[PDB]
């Protein structure tokens, strides 16, 4: 779709692998924010998204947390705490026909800025200056959308660049989007390095005598410390007691 009418794709209840995309050697830019390009197949997320739009080469840098300009303030804005990975690559082979492809638009004029993760497909006449346009197009009244004009015979900064923006999100809710991790056996009564759905650490996983509510999965203590969790596979309550330590 266009930049001002990007399509948001919700991903949930599945296992997502990301190593096959980073090692594909086809994506030009694979910048990750908040996370790393590696060590992501061992984490589980709760709700991720996947945006898709086509911009030009000189505007790929504007799709980043903190960057500002024209395509990052009126069409698609990313938050400053965006925890995801921006994926873009050159596509000057099917999105640029002879003569000029005018199927991609970008919002050029807008009254105010754009809040992060917001879509606006309005096509009202931008009222510039002081004379009310009242719907007509003329002096001080410009159209909000403008065509790109993708021609195959252009520079590196005027070619189509399909951008995919993955918006990861990790919460305390039951995570669904996991990674390719081999589930091991639950070992108890010993201080071992456990690896849950995103709550890592070392401790003695024992049996607890508390009552977890059907909607509750994790647990915490009076000092904001996780002392009990719920098994992903089974429905048992495993109390996380700290490992043995002290002074000498």
């Amino acid at each position, epitope marked *: 779709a266009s930049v001002y009418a990007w399509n948001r794709k919700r991903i949930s209840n599945c296992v997502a692998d990301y190593s096959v995309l980073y090692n594909s050697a086809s994506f030009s830019t694979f910048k990750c924010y908040g996370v790393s390009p590696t060590k992501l197949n061992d984490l589980c997320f709760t709700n991720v998204y996947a945006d898709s739009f086509v911009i030009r080469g000189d505007e790929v840098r504007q799709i980043a947390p903190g960057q500002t300009g024209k395509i990052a303030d009126y069409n698609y804005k990313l938050p400053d705490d965006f925890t995801g990975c921006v994926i873009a690559w050159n596509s000057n082979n099917l999105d640029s026909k002879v003569g000029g492809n005018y199927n991609y638009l970008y919002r050029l004029f807008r009254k105010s800025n754009l809040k992060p993760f917001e879509r606006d497909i309005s096509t009202e*006449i931008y009222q510039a200056g002081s004379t*009310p346009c*009242n*719907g*007509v*197009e003329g002096f001080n009244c410009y*159209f909000p*959308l403008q*065509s790109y004009g993708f021609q195959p015979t252009n520079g590196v900064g005027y070619q189509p660049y399909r951008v995919v923006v993955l918006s990861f999100e990790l919460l305390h809710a039951p995570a669904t989007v996991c990674g390719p991790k081999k589930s091991t056996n639950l070992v108890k009564n010993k201080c071992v390095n456990f690896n849950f759905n995103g709550l890592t650490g070392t401790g003695v996983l024992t049996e607890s005598n508390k009552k977890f509510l059907p909607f509750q999965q994790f647990g915490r203590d009076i000092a904001d410390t996780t002392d009990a969790v719920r098994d992903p596979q089974t429905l048992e309550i495993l109390d996380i007691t700290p490992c043995s330590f002290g002074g000498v």
Partner: antibody
Amino acid sequence: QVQLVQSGAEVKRPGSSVKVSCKASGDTFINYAFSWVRQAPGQGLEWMGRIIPILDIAHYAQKFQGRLTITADKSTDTAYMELTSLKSDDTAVYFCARVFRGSQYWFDPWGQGTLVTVSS
Amino acid sequence: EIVLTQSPGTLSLSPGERATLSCRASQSINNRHLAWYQQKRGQAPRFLIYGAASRATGIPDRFSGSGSGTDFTLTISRLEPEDFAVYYCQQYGSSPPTFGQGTKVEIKR
């Protein structure tokens, strides 16, 4: 500068469809919309519809929703107007107009007109 | 708003005298959205004035129009022999564009 060349007269048969073109020139085809207005003999003008090339949106009139299909090729700069299920009282001079890309517009640039006679 | 009726209809006037063409609307046009045209014999209409107040590109100052809410008037001062055609009205303040009837100015002999 801006010349909207149209086609010629079309001697069509009753109960059929026609296709009149409008060769646009002068400026860019995407920065200006196009509307077609017919003129019955001695009966004023009549706005049929309008298309937006940049948005590919074509909103017709209440009396043409279903029989009027206006297209526009953004490669050859030509606006097409097709009318299906033509009646006998359709011997109007169809004019081409290069309207703006707003909700309200005026038919400043005109063409030459095509006297398409349906009843033959 | 969707209705335009020409009051004169016909006007037998001599070249040189002022002309007055009216266009009555059913409802009121909010932002004086009215346009005037000039269609000669076997030709396309010519855009004359936008907004009923100012000429568009090169129309001389002889063609002038007044601004009102429900009834506009066109003043063709110093009428020339070449300015003998049919003039139409067009209200672009509503969603469906509507036209008028047409006033033909002929030579008075």
